[PDB]
Ligand binder design. Structure first.
Ligand SMILES: [Cl-]
Lengths: 224, 214
């Protein structure tokens, strides 16, 4: 397989700096132009920067001239975006892409993208609460259990169940953004009601920006 | 970039033809090859079409790329529900020496069947009450189309105070999901007989209720 492995987003203060990496396997990376493209949430794609295979030649959108620097280490098949003097407007998902030319230009190979949040507000890790299936909703076919992942900043969080072994039945909801400027989301899983007396349901909550790596057991309600 | 114009949205029914126009100028689309990019919700763009008319590996004949002077057109014949997505045109601009993009176009597939929401409503957890806080969680899934209104009740009196509701979002199966959270004090939760989350969709209501008796 041929791929672009992106790393290095997160929260930074206005004026601050961030470094995006993008490592390459499967192709001789050092001959192909690459670029960085970004997308503010709700909004569309904005090309930002590009670099020749060797590094000899580098191009920049006016929105970033003087502030961002594309570079590459061809001995480590790695591409970078050094982002300096960041502003709130730079808040976006940033992709790297390979730039090929056949009759025209096209970006064929893309990284997964990393969120870059530029804010004066602090990193806050979430509180994690178990959402236990009601006494009623169990005596019957199936049970919905969940984890409330409350009051975090910035996005994103991943939620797993049972260390990733339980994927079937899982709906992780997109986060709400409170008047407080903090995010809450919930992840739910439907399971056979009959499995509740014999099976352990652990949600695994990762919020990389706060270094929160939490495990929470969700067990059925008995009250009344 | 949006030095290229696309329409915000286009709507056909299954099996029909739909086109997405992308108009620029002589320095961009005029004298350079156009690419088309598909974006599924919250994933990286995918190259559909390059050199104006060529399909990437594993893109079907149902997609085509056309170019007439300063406009380019994406064609989708035998439209499937699996084609719902954002479509972006791209090219080089020999004036600005920039790669440029259109503002993107949202493809909707008409006559998909209406679907009432599933509502799960959780009461505050033991642990959250023990931290002197209370969150009612109302999760809303598998509804079509994606427009709901949510009201809350404390003993069937409405409560606007404390409510935060997501805007609807596209699940992988083309149906929508939303979340609504109501923040309370433990004494508000314990004082009332019940709290209700009522979701309204195409005029018809699905309601859920939790009580402190537990
Ligand atoms: Cl060069």
């Amino acid at each position: 397989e041929v791929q672009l492995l992106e790393s290095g987003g997160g929260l930074v203060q206005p004026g601050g700096s961030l470094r995006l990496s993008c490592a390459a396997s499967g192709f001789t990376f050092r001959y192909d132009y690459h670029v960085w493209v970004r997308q503010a949430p709700g909004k569309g794609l904005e090309w930002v920067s590009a670099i020749s295979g060797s590094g000899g030649s580098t191009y920049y959108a006016d929105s970033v001239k003087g502030r961002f620097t594309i570079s590459r280490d061809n001995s480590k098949n790695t591409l970078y975006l050094q982002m300096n003097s960041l502003r709130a407007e730079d808040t976006a998902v940033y992709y790297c892409a390979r730039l090929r030319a056949d009759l025209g230009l096209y970006m064929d190979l893309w990284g997964r993208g990393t969120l870059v949040t530029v804010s004066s507000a602090s990193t806050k890790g979430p509180s994690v609460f178990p959402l236990a299936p009601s006494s009623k909703s169990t005596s019957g076919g199936t049970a919905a259990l969940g984890c409330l992942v409350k009051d975090y900043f910035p996005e994103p969080v991943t939620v797993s169940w049972n260390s990733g072994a339980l994927t079937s039945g899982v709906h992780t909801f997109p986060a709400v953004l409170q008047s407080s400027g903090l995010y809450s989301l919930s992840s739910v899983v439907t399971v056979p009601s009959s499995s509740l007396g014999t099976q352990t349901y652990i949600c695994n909550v990762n919020h990389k920006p706060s270094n929160t790596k939490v495990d929470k057991r969700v067990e059925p309600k008995s009250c009344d | 970039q949006s030095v290229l114009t696309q329409p915000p949205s286009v709507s056909a029914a299954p099996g029909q033809k739909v086109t997405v126009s992308c108009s620029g100028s002589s320095s961009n689309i005029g004298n350079h090859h156009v690419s088309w990019y598909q974006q599924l919700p919250g994933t990286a763009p995918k190259l559909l079409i390059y050199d104006t008319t060529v399909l990437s590996s594993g893109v079907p004949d149902r997609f085509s790329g056309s170019k007439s002077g300063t406009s380019a057109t994406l064609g989708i014949t035998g439209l499937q529900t699996g084609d719902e997505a954002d479509y972006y045109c791209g090219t080089w601009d020999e004036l600005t020496s920039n790669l440029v993009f259109g503002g993107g176009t949202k493809l909707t597939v008409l006559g998909q069947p209406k679907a009432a929401p599933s509502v799960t409503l959780f009461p505050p957890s033991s642990e959250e009450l023990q931290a002197n806080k209370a969150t009612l969680v109302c999760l809303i899934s598998d509804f079509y189309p994606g427009a709901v209104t949510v009201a809350w009740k404390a003993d069937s009196s409405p409560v606007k105070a404390g409510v935060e509701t997501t805007t609807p979002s596209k699940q992988s199966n083309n149906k929508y999901a939303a979340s609504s959270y109501l923040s309370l004090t433990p004494e508000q939760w314990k004082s009332h007989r019940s709290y209700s989350c009522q979701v309204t969709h195409e005029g018809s209501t699905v309601e859920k209720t939790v009580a402190p008796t537990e």
